Design an enzyme around this catalytic site. Sequence first.
Site, short mmCIF file in Angstrom:
data_model
loop_
_atom_site.label_atom_id
_atom_site.label_comp_id
_atom_site.label_asym_id
_atom_site.label_seq_id
_atom_site.Cartn_x
_atom_site.Cartn_y
_atom_site.Cartn_z
N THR A 16 0.77 -1.29 0.02
CA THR A 16 0.17 0.04 -0.08
C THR A 16 0.87 1.44 0.04
O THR A 16 0.42 2.43 0.06
CB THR A 16 -0.95 -0.14 1.21
OG1 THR A 16 -0.13 -0.08 2.51
CG2 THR A 16 -1.85 -1.19 1.15
N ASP A 39 2.01 -10.76 -29.19
CA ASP A 39 3.19 -9.54 -29.45
C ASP A 39 4.39 -10.32 -30.46
O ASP A 39 3.89 -10.74 -31.63
CB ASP A 39 4.04 -9.62 -28.02
CG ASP A 39 4.41 -8.47 -27.87
OD1 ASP A 39 5.78 -7.93 -28.18
OD2 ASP A 39 4.13 -7.73 -26.80
N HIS A 69 10.70 -7.55 -27.38
CA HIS A 69 9.66 -6.96 -26.69
C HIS A 69 8.55 -8.05 -26.04
O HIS A 69 8.19 -8.09 -24.89
CB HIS A 69 8.78 -6.14 -27.61
CG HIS A 69 7.98 -5.31 -27.09
ND1 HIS A 69 6.63 -5.77 -27.26
CD2 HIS A 69 7.82 -4.18 -26.68
CE1 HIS A 69 5.69 -5.03 -26.78
NE2 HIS A 69 6.49 -3.60 -26.42
N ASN A 161 1.43 5.38 -25.61
CA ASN A 161 2.79 6.05 -25.16
C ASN A 161 2.71 7.41 -25.73
O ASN A 161 4.05 7.96 -25.90
CB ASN A 161 4.07 5.52 -25.34
CG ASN A 161 4.02 3.80 -24.67
OD1 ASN A 161 3.51 3.69 -23.58
ND2 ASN A 161 4.47 2.90 -25.47
N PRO A 175 -14.27 0.04 -25.13
CA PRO A 175 -14.44 0.00 -23.55
C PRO A 175 -14.60 -1.31 -22.82
O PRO A 175 -14.30 -1.30 -21.61
CB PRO A 175 -16.04 0.62 -23.64
CG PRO A 175 -16.23 1.12 -24.74
CD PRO A 175 -15.06 0.78 -25.80
N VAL A 177 -12.83 -4.03 -22.73
CA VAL A 177 -11.61 -4.70 -22.29
C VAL A 177 -10.98 -3.80 -21.19
O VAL A 177 -11.51 -2.88 -20.84
CB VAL A 177 -10.49 -4.90 -23.39
CG1 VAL A 177 -11.04 -5.72 -24.59
CG2 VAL A 177 -9.96 -3.56 -24.08
N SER A 224 3.38 -0.67 -22.76
CA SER A 224 3.71 -2.20 -22.94
C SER A 224 4.14 -3.18 -21.48
O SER A 224 4.06 -4.29 -21.39
CB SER A 224 4.55 -2.44 -23.95
OG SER A 224 4.13 -1.95 -25.05
N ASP A 260 -3.53 7.36 -4.73
CA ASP A 260 -2.05 7.41 -4.47
C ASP A 260 -1.11 8.06 -5.52
O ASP A 260 -0.14 8.31 -5.32
CB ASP A 260 -1.67 6.17 -4.09
CG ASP A 260 -2.34 5.58 -2.87
OD1 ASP A 260 -2.61 6.43 -1.85
OD2 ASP A 260 -2.43 4.50 -2.57
CA LIG Z 1 -12.68 -1.12 -19.87
#
Ligand SMILES: [Ca+2]
Length: 279
Positions: A16, A39, A69, A161, A175, A177, A224, A260
């Site tokens: 935490t 990939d 990768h 990125n 949406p 996934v 990634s 956080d």
């Molecule tokens: Ca989603």
Amino acid sequence: AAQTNAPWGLARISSTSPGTSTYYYDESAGQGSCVYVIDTGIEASHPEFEGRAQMVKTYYYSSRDGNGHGTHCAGTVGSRTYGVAKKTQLFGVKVLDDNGSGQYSTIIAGMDFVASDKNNRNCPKGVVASLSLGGGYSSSVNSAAARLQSSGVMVAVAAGNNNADARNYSPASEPSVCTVGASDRYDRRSSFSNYGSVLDIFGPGTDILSTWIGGSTRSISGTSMATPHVAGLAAYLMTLGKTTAASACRYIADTANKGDLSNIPFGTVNLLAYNNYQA
Ligand SMILES: [Ca+2]
């Protein structure tokens, strides 16, 4: 179980607070789950996979990862030293060439392949797919990701990125996934991470140590790298019976560390993946 001197991202998802170095996790470690890494391939012979990785499909001349990768991402899912779910089974699907590129038609075919292939595999605790890739908005690519999720697979995808709103990128903008942004070891949004209302969750993405080709290791950065933390966490939680493929993204969000992170734009969730482990 406890792994001392762990990579910071593994420690972060079992704490935490930032700045710890031990990864605490249940011994079951994702055993009985399966994760497809879609990939550049996976160097399945890397000692860190302990025989638990195999290539099942390639769309190019070889199944070998000539880039690195895909091997890095797979290592964050399930390698012994660098992985979230240290006993999961890993399946590689090579939809990206050795330069890290691929056409949308091939990426779609690989997604439809996983939806069918999982019916021939023994994965009693469930199936995850990790997609550390993306490009400009495409409704067809989004639809392929939605199909994979609908078929009973937990789909985790990178937000991208570009330090931009992920609504303009695919499959990030689908949406249904689980769209994953990146954070750094001081709990800041990674400077490159996309943001926006379509993000579901953040995971560690800056300076992530994992496996690399040639039996090596290296540290790289990206959304990634955040995505396989969340894919591995889903496999881990499914093995424990806490959630299913259909509801894992929502369960991860419900149980996340809340509020956080810093440098989160208004309208983006402030949620950091957390495994809630209690010895
Ligand atoms: Ca989603």
